[PDB]
Ligand binder design. Structure first.
Ligand SMILES: CC(C)CN(C[C@@H](O)[C@H](Cc1ccccc1)NC(=O)O[C@H]1CO[C@H]2OCC[C@H]21)S(=O)(=O)c1ccc([C@H](O)CO)cc1
Lengths: 99, 99
């Protein structure tokens, strides 16, 4: 589809057997998701933006479906205020910016 | 242009007569630029990101050219980690997400 940017580009995702709403975010290298108790091993990470840094847990090779488009990659889990789909997954669903 | 997302969507912008590099950021409501001198009046404002809230200077109705496309809108100036072009200007240059 084509998503205009009058409003936040929120879409439904499926991850860890749960459906959630997330931003398609060209300004994020990586994908950051709200706190959720995913199984498996993880690595600590700190990530920074406006306001400073938050601590997250890095999970690798996580399956995630974005608007019916399947992807698999790294997801960072932590106290983010919003679910953020970053470029590591946006490339996998064929997403581009156009103007 | 059509911009793929294997790399950061960085573009050259012109504001206050000066060229800078900025990130096209669909996850940003607003445009936030690093500390700089800009002519005109401004108002103190607050903006929140992944890590909390920061104080910024709000410049309204500012001329800014983004990758060869003119926009006139609000620009926030403050301690952002990266110059980001948000939806308030992305809409003005006709930017959409497509997949
Ligand atoms: C360069 C950007 C600042 C990076 N960021 C993505 C932005 O899109 C961000 C996404 C967002 C965060 C919190 C609330 C709402 C949106 N937007 C945002 O700050 O926008 C400002 C401005 O306009 C206002 O609207 C929204 C909130 C206001 S990030 O999140 O800090 C981030 C940092 C490091 C990673 C590493 O890649 C991980 O490894 C991934 C993602």
């Amino acid at each position: 589809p084509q998503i205009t940017l009058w409003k936040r580009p929120l879409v439904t995702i499926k991850i860890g057997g749960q459906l959630k709403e997330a931003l398609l975010d060209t300004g994020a290298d990586d994908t950051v998701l709200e706190e959720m108790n995913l199984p498996g091993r993880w690595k600590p990470k700190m990530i920074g933006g406006i306001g400073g840094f938050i601590k997250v847990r890095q999970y690798d090779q996580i399956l995630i479906e974005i608007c019916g488009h399947k992807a698999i990659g790294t997801v960072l889990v932590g106290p983010t205020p919003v679910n953020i789909i970053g470029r590591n997954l946006l490339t996998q669903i064929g997403c581009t910016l156009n103007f």
